[PDB]
Design a protein around this ligand. Structure first.
Ligand SMILES: O=C(O)Cc1c[nH]c2ccccc12
Ligand SMILES: O=C(O)Cc1c[nH]c2ccccc12
Ligand SMILES: O=C(O)CCC(=O)C(=O)O
Ligand SMILES: O=C(O)CCC(=O)C(=O)O
Lengths: 294, 294
Protein backbone atom coordinates (compact mmCIF):
# COMPACT_ATOMS: atom_id res chain seq x y z
CA UNK A 1 0.00 0.00 0.00
CA UNK A 2 2.58 2.65 1.02
CA UNK A 3 5.00 2.91 -1.93
CA UNK A 4 8.49 1.48 -1.51
CA UNK A 5 11.27 3.41 -3.27
CA UNK A 6 14.68 1.90 -3.94
CA UNK A 7 17.11 4.77 -3.59
CA UNK A 8 20.03 3.10 -5.34
CA UNK A 9 17.76 2.51 -8.38
CA UNK A 10 16.21 6.01 -8.47
CA UNK A 11 18.07 8.28 -10.90
CA UNK A 12 18.11 8.36 -14.70
CA UNK A 13 16.91 6.14 -17.54
CA UNK A 14 16.42 2.83 -15.78
CA UNK A 15 16.02 4.92 -12.64
CA UNK A 16 13.46 7.17 -14.34
CA UNK A 17 10.49 4.97 -13.46
CA UNK A 18 11.56 4.80 -9.79
CA UNK A 19 12.03 8.58 -9.62
CA UNK A 20 8.54 9.08 -11.06
CA UNK A 21 7.29 6.63 -8.44
CA UNK A 22 9.06 8.75 -5.79
CA UNK A 23 7.40 11.96 -6.98
CA UNK A 24 4.00 10.28 -7.20
CA UNK A 25 4.23 9.04 -3.62
CA UNK A 26 5.27 12.49 -2.42
CA UNK A 27 2.46 14.11 -4.41
CA UNK A 28 -0.45 11.77 -3.68
CA UNK A 29 0.37 10.53 -0.16
CA UNK A 30 3.42 12.42 1.28
CA UNK A 31 4.82 9.16 2.64
CA UNK A 32 6.98 6.38 1.31
CA UNK A 33 9.34 3.63 2.39
CA UNK A 34 13.02 3.71 1.42
CA UNK A 35 15.16 0.66 0.67
CA UNK A 36 18.62 0.78 -0.89
CA UNK A 37 19.62 3.37 1.69
CA UNK A 38 23.06 1.99 2.34
CA UNK A 39 22.88 2.09 6.15
CA UNK A 40 24.63 -1.19 7.19
CA UNK A 41 22.63 -3.78 9.12
CA UNK A 42 25.41 -4.03 11.68
CA UNK A 43 25.13 -0.32 12.49
CA UNK A 44 21.33 -0.61 12.67
CA UNK A 45 21.59 -3.46 15.15
CA UNK A 46 24.11 -1.58 17.29
CA UNK A 47 21.84 1.47 17.29
CA UNK A 48 18.76 -0.48 18.35
CA UNK A 49 20.71 -1.80 21.34
CA UNK A 50 22.24 1.61 22.12
CA UNK A 51 18.90 3.43 22.08
CA UNK A 52 17.40 0.83 24.41
CA UNK A 53 20.46 1.19 26.67
CA UNK A 54 19.85 4.94 26.83
CA UNK A 55 16.18 4.62 27.79
CA UNK A 56 17.01 1.82 30.26
CA UNK A 57 19.31 4.24 32.08
CA UNK A 58 18.39 5.02 35.70
CA UNK A 59 16.13 8.05 35.90
CA UNK A 60 18.92 10.08 37.48
CA UNK A 61 21.36 9.46 34.60
CA UNK A 62 18.61 10.29 32.08
CA UNK A 63 18.10 13.56 33.92
CA UNK A 64 21.82 14.39 33.82
CA UNK A 65 21.33 14.15 30.03
CA UNK A 66 18.92 17.09 29.91
CA UNK A 67 20.19 20.31 28.30
CA UNK A 68 23.65 18.94 27.60
CA UNK A 69 23.89 21.32 24.68
CA UNK A 70 21.66 24.41 24.46
CA UNK A 71 18.08 23.25 23.91
CA UNK A 72 18.90 19.58 23.44
CA UNK A 73 19.09 16.40 25.42
CA UNK A 74 16.76 14.23 27.42
CA UNK A 75 13.11 15.30 27.57
CA UNK A 76 11.07 13.64 30.36
CA UNK A 77 7.33 12.87 30.21
CA UNK A 78 2.94 11.62 29.15
CA UNK A 79 3.91 8.07 28.22
CA UNK A 80 6.56 9.79 26.07
CA UNK A 81 10.27 10.33 26.72
CA UNK A 82 12.94 11.31 24.23
CA UNK A 83 16.47 12.47 23.50
CA UNK A 84 16.58 15.37 21.03
CA UNK A 85 19.56 16.83 19.19
CA UNK A 86 19.57 20.18 17.38
CA UNK A 87 21.31 21.06 15.11
CA UNK A 88 22.00 17.49 13.90
CA UNK A 89 23.42 18.82 10.61
CA UNK A 90 26.09 20.77 12.51
CA UNK A 91 29.12 18.55 13.24
CA UNK A 92 30.08 20.62 16.30
CA UNK A 93 26.62 20.11 17.83
CA UNK A 94 26.63 16.38 17.09
CA UNK A 95 30.12 15.97 18.56
CA UNK A 96 29.33 17.91 21.74
CA UNK A 97 26.02 16.15 22.27
CA UNK A 98 27.61 12.72 22.02
CA UNK A 99 30.65 13.73 24.09
CA UNK A 100 28.34 15.08 26.79
CA UNK A 101 25.94 12.14 27.06
CA UNK A 102 26.12 10.37 30.40
CA UNK A 103 26.36 6.88 28.88
CA UNK A 104 29.00 4.22 28.09
CA UNK A 105 31.55 5.27 25.44
CA UNK A 106 30.43 2.54 23.03
CA UNK A 107 26.87 3.92 23.24
CA UNK A 108 27.94 7.54 22.62
CA UNK A 109 29.97 6.49 19.58
CA UNK A 110 27.08 4.45 18.07
CA UNK A 111 24.64 7.34 18.47
CA UNK A 112 27.19 9.64 16.86
CA UNK A 113 27.69 7.31 13.86
CA UNK A 114 23.98 6.79 13.42
CA UNK A 115 23.01 10.47 13.59
CA UNK A 116 25.74 11.20 11.04
CA UNK A 117 24.54 8.40 8.74
CA UNK A 118 20.90 9.51 9.08
CA UNK A 119 21.89 13.07 8.18
CA UNK A 120 23.61 11.89 4.97
CA UNK A 121 20.55 9.76 4.17
CA UNK A 122 17.99 12.55 4.57
CA UNK A 123 20.16 14.89 2.49
CA UNK A 124 20.34 12.20 -0.21
CA UNK A 125 16.56 11.70 -0.08
CA UNK A 126 15.88 15.46 -0.22
CA UNK A 127 18.15 15.67 -3.28
CA UNK A 128 16.35 12.87 -5.10
CA UNK A 129 12.98 14.47 -4.29
CA UNK A 130 14.20 17.81 -5.64
CA UNK A 131 15.43 16.09 -8.81
CA UNK A 132 12.04 14.40 -9.37
CA UNK A 133 10.66 17.96 -9.68
CA UNK A 134 13.33 18.82 -12.26
CA UNK A 135 15.47 20.76 -9.78
CA UNK A 136 19.25 20.38 -9.81
CA UNK A 137 21.91 22.39 -8.06
CA UNK A 138 19.94 22.36 -4.79
CA UNK A 139 22.10 21.41 -1.80
CA UNK A 140 20.41 20.41 1.45
CA UNK A 141 23.67 19.60 3.25
CA UNK A 142 23.58 22.60 5.58
CA UNK A 143 19.88 22.80 6.25
CA UNK A 144 19.32 22.48 10.02
CA UNK A 145 18.04 19.16 11.29
CA UNK A 146 16.58 17.71 14.46
CA UNK A 147 17.60 14.16 15.42
CA UNK A 148 15.32 12.43 17.88
CA UNK A 149 15.23 9.19 19.81
CA UNK A 150 11.92 8.41 21.47
CA UNK A 151 10.21 5.81 23.64
CA UNK A 152 6.46 5.44 24.28
CA UNK A 153 5.88 3.61 27.56
CA UNK A 154 2.77 1.70 26.60
CA UNK A 155 0.89 -0.36 29.19
CA UNK A 156 -2.12 -2.68 28.91
CA UNK A 157 -4.43 0.31 29.44
CA UNK A 158 -3.15 2.33 26.47
CA UNK A 159 -3.74 -0.39 23.87
CA UNK A 160 -6.28 0.85 21.33
CA UNK A 161 -5.75 4.55 22.02
CA UNK A 162 -3.97 6.74 19.44
CA UNK A 163 -0.52 6.93 21.08
CA UNK A 164 0.16 10.18 19.19
CA UNK A 165 -2.52 12.65 18.04
CA UNK A 166 -2.88 13.69 14.39
CA UNK A 167 -0.42 16.29 13.17
CA UNK A 168 1.95 17.13 10.38
CA UNK A 169 5.65 17.74 10.75
CA UNK A 170 6.37 21.42 10.43
CA UNK A 171 9.60 20.91 8.45
CA UNK A 172 10.62 19.71 5.00
CA UNK A 173 11.12 15.95 5.20
CA UNK A 174 11.42 13.38 7.95
CA UNK A 175 13.16 10.01 7.92
CA UNK A 176 11.87 7.57 10.54
CA UNK A 177 13.10 4.18 11.77
CA UNK A 178 10.17 2.49 13.54
CA UNK A 179 10.30 -0.25 16.15
CA UNK A 180 10.29 -3.54 14.22
CA UNK A 181 8.10 -5.21 16.85
CA UNK A 182 5.55 -2.47 17.55
CA UNK A 183 4.23 -0.47 14.61
CA UNK A 184 1.63 2.24 15.11
CA UNK A 185 2.51 4.73 12.38
CA UNK A 186 -0.69 5.57 10.50
CA UNK A 187 -0.87 8.21 7.78
CA UNK A 188 -4.05 9.87 6.50
CA UNK A 189 -4.39 8.92 2.85
CA UNK A 190 -5.58 12.22 1.32
CA UNK A 191 -7.34 10.36 -1.52
CA UNK A 192 -9.71 8.30 0.68
CA UNK A 193 -9.68 10.34 3.89
CA UNK A 194 -8.81 7.12 5.77
CA UNK A 195 -5.89 6.20 8.01
CA UNK A 196 -3.50 3.66 6.51
CA UNK A 197 -1.16 1.66 8.77
CA UNK A 198 2.52 1.96 7.98
CA UNK A 199 3.38 -1.55 9.17
CA UNK A 200 7.01 -1.97 10.29
CA UNK A 201 9.38 -3.39 7.67
CA UNK A 202 12.80 -4.32 9.07
CA UNK A 203 15.86 -2.50 7.75
CA UNK A 204 13.83 0.04 5.74
CA UNK A 205 13.06 3.64 6.67
CA UNK A 206 9.86 5.68 6.31
CA UNK A 207 9.92 9.18 4.77
CA UNK A 208 7.23 11.80 5.52
CA UNK A 209 6.74 15.16 3.79
CA UNK A 210 6.12 18.09 6.16
CA UNK A 211 4.60 21.56 5.99
CA UNK A 212 7.76 23.18 4.62
CA UNK A 213 7.83 20.48 1.96
CA UNK A 214 4.34 21.50 0.81
CA UNK A 215 5.32 25.17 0.76
CA UNK A 216 8.76 24.83 -0.84
CA UNK A 217 7.33 22.57 -3.52
CA UNK A 218 4.62 25.16 -4.29
CA UNK A 219 1.91 22.71 -3.34
CA UNK A 220 3.29 19.77 -5.29
CA UNK A 221 4.38 17.57 -2.35
CA UNK A 222 1.74 16.61 0.20
CA UNK A 223 2.31 17.43 3.88
CA UNK A 224 1.09 14.17 5.34
CA UNK A 225 -1.10 13.95 8.41
CA UNK A 226 -0.12 11.13 10.72
CA UNK A 227 -0.57 9.61 14.18
CA UNK A 228 0.67 6.66 16.24
CA UNK A 229 -1.87 4.17 17.60
CA UNK A 230 -0.87 2.10 20.61
CA UNK A 231 -1.23 -1.43 19.27
CA UNK A 232 0.48 -3.48 22.00
CA UNK A 233 1.34 -3.19 25.68
CA UNK A 234 5.07 -2.98 24.97
CA UNK A 235 7.26 0.14 24.94
CA UNK A 236 7.68 1.47 21.39
CA UNK A 237 11.11 2.87 20.48
CA UNK A 238 11.79 4.89 17.35
CA UNK A 239 14.36 7.17 15.78
CA UNK A 240 13.72 10.16 13.52
CA UNK A 241 15.78 12.71 11.59
CA UNK A 242 13.90 15.96 10.76
CA UNK A 243 15.14 18.02 7.83
CA UNK A 244 13.81 21.43 8.81
CA UNK A 245 14.47 24.33 6.42
CA UNK A 246 17.30 26.29 4.74
CA UNK A 247 20.18 27.63 6.80
CA UNK A 248 18.95 31.21 6.22
CA UNK A 249 15.53 30.05 7.60
CA UNK A 250 13.64 31.33 4.55
CA UNK A 251 10.92 29.17 2.99
CA UNK A 252 10.18 30.07 -0.65
CA UNK A 253 9.31 27.82 -3.57
CA UNK A 254 11.94 27.86 -6.32
CA UNK A 255 11.13 29.67 -9.55
CA UNK A 256 10.71 26.56 -11.68
CA UNK A 257 7.83 25.27 -9.57
CA UNK A 258 5.54 28.25 -10.35
CA UNK A 259 3.63 27.34 -13.51
CA UNK A 260 0.77 29.33 -14.91
CA UNK A 261 -1.49 26.37 -14.25
CA UNK A 262 -0.17 26.13 -10.64
CA UNK A 263 0.46 29.75 -9.54
CA UNK A 264 2.56 30.59 -6.50
CA UNK A 265 0.70 29.32 -3.44
CA UNK A 266 2.42 30.74 -0.36
CA UNK A 267 4.11 33.97 0.55
CA UNK A 268 7.75 33.67 1.48
CA UNK A 269 8.14 33.07 5.20
CA UNK A 270 10.68 32.33 7.94
CA UNK A 271 10.54 28.78 9.27
CA UNK A 272 11.01 29.90 12.90
CA UNK A 273 8.05 32.28 12.54
CA UNK A 274 5.93 29.48 11.06
CA UNK A 275 6.80 27.31 14.06
CA UNK A 276 5.65 30.12 16.36
CA UNK A 277 2.45 30.33 14.29
CA UNK A 278 1.69 26.64 14.86
CA UNK A 279 2.42 27.19 18.55
CA UNK A 280 0.13 30.17 19.05
CA UNK A 281 -2.79 28.84 16.94
CA UNK A 282 -2.65 25.20 17.98
CA UNK A 283 -2.88 24.34 14.24
CA UNK A 284 -0.44 21.40 14.07
CA UNK A 285 -1.86 19.55 11.06
CA UNK A 286 -0.97 22.06 8.34
CA UNK A 287 -3.99 24.34 8.78
CA UNK A 288 -1.76 27.29 9.65
CA UNK A 289 -0.31 27.25 6.13
CA UNK A 290 -3.65 28.57 4.89
CA UNK A 291 -2.87 31.74 6.79
CA UNK A 292 0.25 32.06 4.59
CA UNK A 293 -1.40 31.88 1.13
CA UNK A 294 -0.08 34.32 -1.43
CA UNK B 1 19.05 -14.35 34.28
CA UNK B 2 20.38 -16.78 31.65
CA UNK B 3 24.20 -16.58 31.51
CA UNK B 4 25.67 -15.01 28.37
CA UNK B 5 28.86 -16.54 26.94
CA UNK B 6 31.13 -14.78 24.47
CA UNK B 7 32.47 -17.46 22.14
CA UNK B 8 35.38 -15.41 20.80
CA UNK B 9 36.50 -14.86 24.41
CA UNK B 10 36.10 -18.48 25.62
CA UNK B 11 39.11 -20.70 25.02
CA UNK B 12 42.29 -20.45 27.06
CA UNK B 13 44.14 -18.11 29.40
CA UNK B 14 42.30 -14.83 29.04
CA UNK B 15 39.22 -16.89 28.19
CA UNK B 16 39.68 -19.38 31.05
CA UNK B 17 37.11 -17.57 33.16
CA UNK B 18 34.62 -17.54 30.26
CA UNK B 19 35.08 -21.27 29.61
CA UNK B 20 34.36 -21.99 33.25
CA UNK B 21 31.26 -19.80 33.02
CA UNK B 22 30.23 -21.92 30.03
CA UNK B 23 30.63 -25.20 31.91
CA UNK B 24 28.84 -23.83 34.94
CA UNK B 25 25.88 -22.71 32.85
CA UNK B 26 25.69 -26.12 31.17
CA UNK B 27 26.00 -28.01 34.47
CA UNK B 28 23.59 -25.99 36.57
CA UNK B 29 21.06 -24.68 34.00
CA UNK B 30 21.58 -26.50 30.69
CA UNK B 31 20.91 -23.20 28.89
CA UNK B 32 22.93 -20.14 27.94
CA UNK B 33 23.10 -17.30 25.44
CA UNK B 34 25.96 -16.97 22.91
CA UNK B 35 27.41 -13.74 21.59
CA UNK B 36 30.59 -13.41 19.57
CA UNK B 37 29.30 -16.12 17.25
CA UNK B 38 30.33 -14.40 14.03
CA UNK B 39 27.02 -14.75 12.14
CA UNK B 40 26.98 -11.38 10.35
CA UNK B 41 24.04 -8.99 10.97
CA UNK B 42 23.24 -8.63 7.31
CA UNK B 43 22.79 -12.39 6.96
CA UNK B 44 20.61 -12.52 10.07
CA UNK B 45 18.43 -9.78 8.60
CA UNK B 46 18.16 -11.49 5.23
CA UNK B 47 17.22 -14.78 6.92
CA UNK B 48 14.49 -13.19 9.05
CA UNK B 49 12.87 -11.96 5.83
CA UNK B 50 13.41 -15.24 3.95
CA UNK B 51 11.86 -17.34 6.73
CA UNK B 52 8.86 -15.01 6.84
CA UNK B 53 8.63 -15.25 3.04
CA UNK B 54 8.62 -19.05 3.27
CA UNK B 55 5.84 -19.09 5.84
CA UNK B 56 3.89 -16.46 3.86
CA UNK B 57 3.83 -18.74 0.81
CA UNK B 58 0.43 -19.90 -0.47
CA UNK B 59 -0.74 -23.27 0.82
CA UNK B 60 -0.04 -24.99 -2.49
CA UNK B 61 3.59 -23.81 -2.55
CA UNK B 62 3.98 -25.08 1.04
CA UNK B 63 2.62 -28.50 0.06
CA UNK B 64 5.00 -28.65 -2.89
CA UNK B 65 7.71 -28.25 -0.23
CA UNK B 66 6.68 -31.38 1.67
CA UNK B 67 9.02 -34.35 1.33
CA UNK B 68 11.41 -32.54 -1.03
CA UNK B 69 14.17 -34.79 0.31
CA UNK B 70 13.44 -38.00 2.16
CA UNK B 71 11.85 -37.15 5.50
CA UNK B 72 12.38 -33.39 5.17
CA UNK B 73 10.41 -30.39 3.97
CA UNK B 74 7.31 -28.54 5.02
CA UNK B 75 5.09 -29.93 7.79
CA UNK B 76 1.56 -28.49 8.13
CA UNK B 77 -0.43 -27.98 11.35
CA UNK B 78 -2.59 -27.09 15.53
CA UNK B 79 -1.06 -23.65 15.48
CA UNK B 80 2.42 -24.99 14.54
CA UNK B 81 3.94 -25.31 11.07
CA UNK B 82 7.53 -25.76 10.07
CA UNK B 83 10.22 -26.58 7.53
CA UNK B 84 12.73 -29.21 8.61
CA UNK B 85 15.98 -30.41 7.06
CA UNK B 86 17.78 -33.64 7.96
CA UNK B 87 20.72 -34.21 7.63
CA UNK B 88 21.75 -30.56 7.98
CA UNK B 89 25.38 -31.53 8.63
CA UNK B 90 25.45 -33.34 5.27
CA UNK B 91 26.32 -31.00 2.39
CA UNK B 92 24.52 -33.16 -0.15
CA UNK B 93 21.23 -32.97 1.81
CA UNK B 94 21.51 -29.22 2.38
CA UNK B 95 22.25 -28.63 -1.31
CA UNK B 96 19.29 -30.74 -2.51
CA UNK B 97 16.86 -29.31 0.04
CA UNK B 98 17.60 -25.71 -0.99
CA UNK B 99 17.69 -26.60 -4.70
CA UNK B 100 14.24 -28.20 -4.37
CA UNK B 101 12.45 -25.59 -2.30
CA UNK B 102 9.62 -23.94 -4.18
CA UNK B 103 10.64 -20.36 -3.48
CA UNK B 104 12.49 -17.50 -5.17
CA UNK B 105 16.22 -18.11 -5.79
CA UNK B 106 17.28 -15.46 -3.26
CA UNK B 107 15.27 -17.17 -0.50
CA UNK B 108 16.84 -20.56 -1.33
CA UNK B 109 20.35 -19.12 -1.27
CA UNK B 110 19.74 -17.33 2.06
CA UNK B 111 18.37 -20.45 3.69
CA UNK B 112 21.35 -22.41 2.40
CA UNK B 113 23.86 -19.92 3.78
CA UNK B 114 22.08 -19.76 7.09
CA UNK B 115 21.85 -23.55 7.52
CA UNK B 116 25.54 -23.86 6.73
CA UNK B 117 26.48 -21.03 9.13
CA UNK B 118 24.33 -22.45 11.91
CA UNK B 119 26.00 -25.81 11.41
CA UNK B 120 29.47 -24.27 11.87
CA UNK B 121 28.17 -22.45 14.95
CA UNK B 122 26.80 -25.53 16.69
CA UNK B 123 29.99 -27.48 15.95
CA UNK B 124 32.05 -24.61 17.42
CA UNK B 125 29.80 -24.47 20.48
CA UNK B 126 29.99 -28.26 20.93
CA UNK B 127 33.80 -28.12 20.74
CA UNK B 128 33.98 -25.42 23.40
CA UNK B 129 31.62 -27.34 25.69
CA UNK B 130 33.82 -30.44 25.26
CA UNK B 131 36.93 -28.39 26.03
CA UNK B 132 35.31 -27.05 29.21
CA UNK B 133 35.28 -30.68 30.44
CA UNK B 134 38.98 -31.10 29.64
CA UNK B 135 38.17 -32.93 26.40
CA UNK B 136 40.14 -32.18 23.24
CA UNK B 137 40.42 -34.02 19.95
CA UNK B 138 36.64 -34.43 19.81
CA UNK B 139 35.24 -33.72 16.34
CA UNK B 140 31.53 -32.93 16.04
CA UNK B 141 31.74 -31.86 12.38
CA UNK B 142 29.99 -34.98 11.07
CA UNK B 143 27.38 -35.62 13.76
CA UNK B 144 23.90 -35.63 12.16
CA UNK B 145 21.93 -32.41 12.63
CA UNK B 146 18.36 -31.23 12.12
CA UNK B 147 17.68 -27.66 10.95
CA UNK B 148 14.18 -26.37 11.64
CA UNK B 149 12.29 -23.20 10.72
CA UNK B 150 9.18 -22.82 12.84
CA UNK B 151 6.03 -20.70 12.92
CA UNK B 152 3.44 -20.69 15.72
CA UNK B 153 0.27 -19.04 14.44
CA UNK B 154 -0.88 -17.21 17.53
CA UNK B 155 -4.10 -15.21 17.69
CA UNK B 156 -5.92 -13.18 20.33
CA UNK B 157 -7.38 -16.47 21.61
CA UNK B 158 -3.90 -18.05 22.05
CA UNK B 159 -2.56 -15.48 24.50
CA UNK B 160 -1.80 -16.97 27.91
CA UNK B 161 -1.74 -20.52 26.51
CA UNK B 162 1.31 -22.81 26.12
CA UNK B 163 2.80 -22.62 22.64
CA UNK B 164 4.76 -25.85 23.19
CA UNK B 165 4.49 -28.17 26.21
CA UNK B 166 7.32 -29.03 28.63
CA UNK B 167 10.02 -31.28 27.19
CA UNK B 168 13.73 -31.76 26.73
CA UNK B 169 15.42 -32.08 23.38
CA UNK B 170 16.49 -35.69 22.81
CA UNK B 171 19.77 -34.66 21.18
CA UNK B 172 23.11 -33.26 22.30
CA UNK B 173 22.88 -29.46 21.91
CA UNK B 174 20.43 -27.08 20.26
CA UNK B 175 21.11 -23.57 18.96
CA UNK B 176 17.98 -21.40 18.71
CA UNK B 177 17.29 -18.01 17.12
CA UNK B 178 14.07 -16.72 18.70
CA UNK B 179 11.72 -14.09 17.33
CA UNK B 180 12.99 -10.70 18.52
CA UNK B 181 9.42 -9.46 18.95
CA UNK B 182 7.63 -12.53 20.32
CA UNK B 183 9.31 -14.26 23.23
CA UNK B 184 7.66 -17.07 25.14
CA UNK B 185 10.57 -19.48 25.65
CA UNK B 186 10.88 -20.52 29.27
CA UNK B 187 13.35 -22.90 30.90
CA UNK B 188 13.11 -24.77 34.19
CA UNK B 189 15.98 -23.17 36.09
CA UNK B 190 17.39 -25.83 38.46
CA UNK B 191 18.18 -23.27 41.17
CA UNK B 192 14.70 -21.74 41.13
CA UNK B 193 12.16 -24.48 40.86
CA UNK B 194 9.95 -22.46 38.53
CA UNK B 195 10.11 -21.69 34.81
CA UNK B 196 11.95 -18.48 33.95
CA UNK B 197 11.59 -16.67 30.61
CA UNK B 198 14.41 -16.56 28.13
CA UNK B 199 13.48 -13.14 26.79
CA UNK B 200 14.76 -12.61 23.23
CA UNK B 201 17.95 -10.56 22.85
CA UNK B 202 18.55 -9.49 19.24
CA UNK B 203 21.48 -10.93 17.32
CA UNK B 204 22.20 -13.48 20.09
CA UNK B 205 21.46 -17.22 20.09
CA UNK B 206 20.23 -19.49 22.89
CA UNK B 207 21.92 -22.85 23.43
CA UNK B 208 20.11 -25.71 25.19
CA UNK B 209 21.59 -29.01 26.35
CA UNK B 210 19.54 -32.09 25.51
CA UNK B 211 19.25 -35.65 26.77
CA UNK B 212 22.22 -36.95 24.77
CA UNK B 213 24.25 -34.10 26.26
CA UNK B 214 23.40 -35.38 29.77
CA UNK B 215 24.30 -38.96 28.84
CA UNK B 216 27.46 -38.22 26.84
CA UNK B 217 28.70 -35.97 29.64
CA UNK B 218 28.14 -38.71 32.23
CA UNK B 219 25.63 -36.56 34.04
CA UNK B 220 27.74 -33.39 34.08
CA UNK B 221 25.65 -31.29 31.67
CA UNK B 222 22.00 -30.68 32.51
CA UNK B 223 19.35 -31.58 29.94
CA UNK B 224 17.14 -28.53 30.36
CA UNK B 225 13.37 -28.72 30.51
CA UNK B 226 11.77 -26.00 28.43
CA UNK B 227 8.46 -24.81 27.06
CA UNK B 228 7.04 -21.85 25.14
CA UNK B 229 4.17 -19.76 26.49
CA UNK B 230 2.10 -17.75 24.04
CA UNK B 231 2.78 -14.20 25.15
CA UNK B 232 1.33 -12.19 22.27
CA UNK B 233 -1.36 -12.33 19.60
CA UNK B 234 1.09 -12.39 16.66
CA UNK B 235 2.87 -15.34 14.99
CA UNK B 236 6.18 -16.37 16.56
CA UNK B 237 8.92 -17.39 14.12
CA UNK B 238 12.04 -19.23 15.19
CA UNK B 239 15.00 -21.07 13.74
CA UNK B 240 16.78 -23.97 15.39
CA UNK B 241 19.72 -26.24 14.70
CA UNK B 242 19.76 -29.57 16.58
CA UNK B 243 23.07 -31.35 17.01
CA UNK B 244 21.89 -34.92 17.51
CA UNK B 245 24.47 -37.67 18.12
CA UNK B 246 27.61 -39.24 16.62
CA UNK B 247 27.57 -40.48 13.03
CA UNK B 248 27.73 -44.13 14.17
CA UNK B 249 24.66 -43.26 16.31
CA UNK B 250 26.23 -44.51 19.55
CA UNK B 251 25.88 -42.49 22.76
CA UNK B 252 28.69 -43.28 25.22
CA UNK B 253 30.35 -40.97 27.70
CA UNK B 254 34.11 -40.47 27.27
CA UNK B 255 36.40 -42.08 29.84
CA UNK B 256 37.61 -38.86 31.47
CA UNK B 257 34.14 -37.84 32.74
CA UNK B 258 33.72 -40.97 34.94
CA UNK B 259 35.79 -40.86 38.15
CA UNK B 260 35.68 -42.27 41.66
CA UNK B 261 33.14 -39.59 42.62
CA UNK B 262 31.13 -39.61 39.35
CA UNK B 263 30.81 -43.25 38.20
CA UNK B 264 29.39 -44.20 34.81
CA UNK B 265 25.73 -43.21 34.83
CA UNK B 266 24.22 -44.66 31.64
CA UNK B 267 24.71 -47.74 29.55
CA UNK B 268 25.80 -47.18 25.96
CA UNK B 269 22.82 -46.77 23.63
CA UNK B 270 21.89 -45.98 20.04
CA UNK B 271 20.37 -42.52 19.67
CA UNK B 272 17.77 -43.89 17.26
CA UNK B 273 16.71 -46.42 19.90
CA UNK B 274 16.47 -43.67 22.51
CA UNK B 275 14.14 -41.69 20.21
CA UNK B 276 11.96 -44.79 19.85
CA UNK B 277 11.89 -45.13 23.64
CA UNK B 278 10.72 -41.52 24.07
CA UNK B 279 8.06 -42.07 21.38
CA UNK B 280 6.73 -45.30 22.91
CA UNK B 281 6.82 -44.25 26.61
CA UNK B 282 5.72 -40.66 25.97
CA UNK B 283 8.57 -39.61 28.29
CA UNK B 284 9.86 -36.50 26.51
CA UNK B 285 11.38 -34.54 29.39
CA UNK B 286 14.33 -36.85 30.04
CA UNK B 287 12.51 -39.33 32.29
CA UNK B 288 13.26 -42.09 29.79
CA UNK B 289 17.00 -41.77 30.46
CA UNK B 290 16.40 -43.42 33.83
CA UNK B 291 15.52 -46.58 31.94
CA UNK B 292 19.12 -46.54 30.64
CA UNK B 293 21.00 -46.62 33.97
CA UNK B 294 24.26 -48.56 33.93
O1 LIG C 1 7.33 21.84 14.41
C1 LIG C 1 7.73 21.68 15.59
O2 LIG C 1 8.12 20.54 15.97
C2 LIG C 1 7.76 22.86 16.55
C3 LIG C 1 6.32 23.31 16.84
C4 LIG C 1 6.07 24.63 17.16
N1 LIG C 1 4.74 24.76 17.36
C5 LIG C 1 4.15 23.53 17.17
C6 LIG C 1 2.82 23.10 17.25
C7 LIG C 1 2.50 21.77 17.01
C8 LIG C 1 3.50 20.87 16.68
C9 LIG C 1 4.81 21.29 16.60
C10 LIG C 1 5.14 22.64 16.85
O1 LIG D 1 12.70 -34.13 17.03
C1 LIG D 1 12.11 -35.01 16.35
O2 LIG D 1 11.50 -34.71 15.28
C2 LIG D 1 12.13 -36.47 16.78
C3 LIG D 1 12.06 -36.64 18.29
C4 LIG D 1 13.24 -36.87 18.97
N1 LIG D 1 12.93 -37.00 20.29
C5 LIG D 1 11.57 -36.86 20.40
C6 LIG D 1 10.71 -36.91 21.48
C7 LIG D 1 9.35 -36.72 21.35
C8 LIG D 1 8.82 -36.51 20.09
C9 LIG D 1 9.65 -36.47 19.00
C10 LIG D 1 11.04 -36.64 19.17
O1 LIG E 1 6.56 8.04 14.62
C1 LIG E 1 7.24 8.23 15.68
O2 LIG E 1 7.25 7.37 16.61
C2 LIG E 1 8.07 9.50 15.89
C3 LIG E 1 8.02 10.48 14.72
C4 LIG E 1 6.70 11.25 14.64
O3 LIG E 1 5.68 10.76 14.98
C5 LIG E 1 6.74 12.67 14.07
O4 LIG E 1 6.88 12.84 12.84
O5 LIG E 1 6.64 13.68 14.82
O1 LIG F 1 10.33 -23.44 17.91
C1 LIG F 1 10.86 -22.98 18.94
O2 LIG F 1 10.79 -21.77 19.26
C2 LIG F 1 11.61 -23.92 19.86
C3 LIG F 1 10.63 -24.90 20.49
C4 LIG F 1 11.37 -25.82 21.42
O3 LIG F 1 10.89 -26.12 22.50
C5 LIG F 1 12.67 -26.36 21.02
O4 LIG F 1 13.60 -25.56 20.77
O5 LIG F 1 12.82 -27.60 20.94
Amino acid sequence: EIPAIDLRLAGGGGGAEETARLRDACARLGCFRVSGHGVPPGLQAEMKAAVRALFDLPDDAKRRNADIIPGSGYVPPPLYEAFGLCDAAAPADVDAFCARLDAPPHVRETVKAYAERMHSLIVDVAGKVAASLGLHGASFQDWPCQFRMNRYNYTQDSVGSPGVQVHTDSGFLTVLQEDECVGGLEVLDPAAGEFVPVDPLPGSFVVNVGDVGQAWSNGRLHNVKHRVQCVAAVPRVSIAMFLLAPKDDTVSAPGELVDGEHPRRYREFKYDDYRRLRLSTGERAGEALARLAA
